Amino acid sequence: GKALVIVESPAKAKTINKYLGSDYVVKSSVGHIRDLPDERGALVNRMGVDPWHNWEAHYEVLPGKEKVVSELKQLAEKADHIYLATDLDREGEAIAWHLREVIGGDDARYSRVVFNEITKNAIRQAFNKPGELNIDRVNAQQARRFMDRVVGYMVSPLLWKKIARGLSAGRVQSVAVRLVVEREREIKAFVPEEFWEVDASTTTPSGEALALQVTHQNDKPFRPVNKEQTQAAVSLLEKARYSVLEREDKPTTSKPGAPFITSTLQQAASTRLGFGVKKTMMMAQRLYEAGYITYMRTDSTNLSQDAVNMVRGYISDNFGKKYLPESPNQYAHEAIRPSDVNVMAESLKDMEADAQKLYQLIWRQFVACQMTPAKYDSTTLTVGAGDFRLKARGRILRFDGWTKVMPALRILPAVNKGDALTLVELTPAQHFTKPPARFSEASLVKELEKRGIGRPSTYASIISTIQDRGYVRVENRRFYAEKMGEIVTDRLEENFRELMNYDFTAQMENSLDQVANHEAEWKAVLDHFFSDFTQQLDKAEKDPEEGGMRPN
């Protein structure tokens, strides 16, 4: 009679039931239901996957999930049609595939509903228009997991043998570790270069104070490398006559950022709220399942016509016509944004302080992204003093614009060209060049994004995995490569060069994308991967004198 609707969690179940009437019975699977646990039978047994017999797999129902299978199966008969309401990503697709496979029955009896938020409208549309299970996206998800399995299960033994028991290799994890290790070595090997800067304090005809930075001497960039060059220049600057050579006023603006995507949210929540990548995604997931924000795994900065018109309505009524663009901002599945702009952080019920803060961050970025630019009247003064050229840069806020939604918060004095300035004080400053900055949780996420290595569904698992596996650590909010991280990275780089290659790893993500869009076949892709991998693994297993992996 009714329509059976399956979601992956009870939290989602509860929310979505609010928007589905009596023709539907909503049920959670309490998790994922089913999943995995030159051949060597016991290896295939362990992996659940057989690389030598065409990727044939052995899925088993997770522990405690047998009652679940019964419960769903029995519900499945009393219903005329079944709606697989899993999250929209490839993993959600595969979870839906598992539910269908286990429940059984005629395919025709199934629909796969997609939605990027759990609201009255998004739900009514998802079910009005319920499509079919996309086998390609399931295939793309299994390919990824089959290759992750393979690397984890087949490379790890080599590390136990050569290096130490209990070590774990990760196909992409090793690559992330590899970024941290390279940095460690950069920092280690850096030799700072000494250089000085001289600033001069002056006074305007008006008596106003004006600070300057020496930029040139003899029409060439100014840069003493030691105290004596600095002192020589200080003696001359002391005697020179200062005059304004040029005043460059120019209107400048600052634009608001695009709305959040998985990567930029991790960075922002880390940098602004001191939240770690894992905490952010867990809180973001709860906000999403509770119906407060759009889906947290996305890389699209797209905003729907309705989303944009409701925020413009909000800006118009709460800030005013001058904060509202003439036309909506187009920045480019949807970005992460609140589901209803009229819902404030302070009003979330099932959420705690930190998840409210993250909502507030998402809400402000969303509102700010559709507001007008901030306007500043900027000035750049170029001064002349003998053989020297000095500069001063300032700006005055003209109009706050988008910054109005953000919490509340150099102004050069007016001078004219040809104006004389009286030197008040000269202040030399010793400086040293610095090595490359350590990665923070944000810089690392940004780096994985920039290199095409991470994905919205992986960013945080990569970040957390490499730490837990003892390869790198985070202290004073920065990443440090552990010795075992360096030990494993060198071994891996030497014997599994292609596996560790950055471009090859980015290409695997695209090869996966190719499968999801029917541009490649999963098993063919798994075969290509396994062929390159086993030859690598064949060599690495030899003795060091024949090029295999070096021990200890």
From Swiss-Prot:
- Give the source species: Escherichia coli (strain K12)
Q: Which GO terms describe its biological process?
A: DNA topological change
Q: What class of enzyme is it?
A: isomerase
UniProt name for this protein? DNA topoisomerase 1
Q: Domain Toprim spans what residues?
A: 2-118
Q: How does this polypeptide assemble, per the annotation?
A: Monomer.
Q: Where do the record's region annotations for Interaction with DNA lie?
A: 168-173
Q: Which gene encodes it?
A: topA
Binding of Mg(2+) occurs at 8, 87
Induced by what?
Answer: Transcription is increased specifically in response to 2,4,6-trinitrotoluene (TNT) and its indicator compounds 1,3-DNB, 2,4-DNT, and 2,6-DNT.
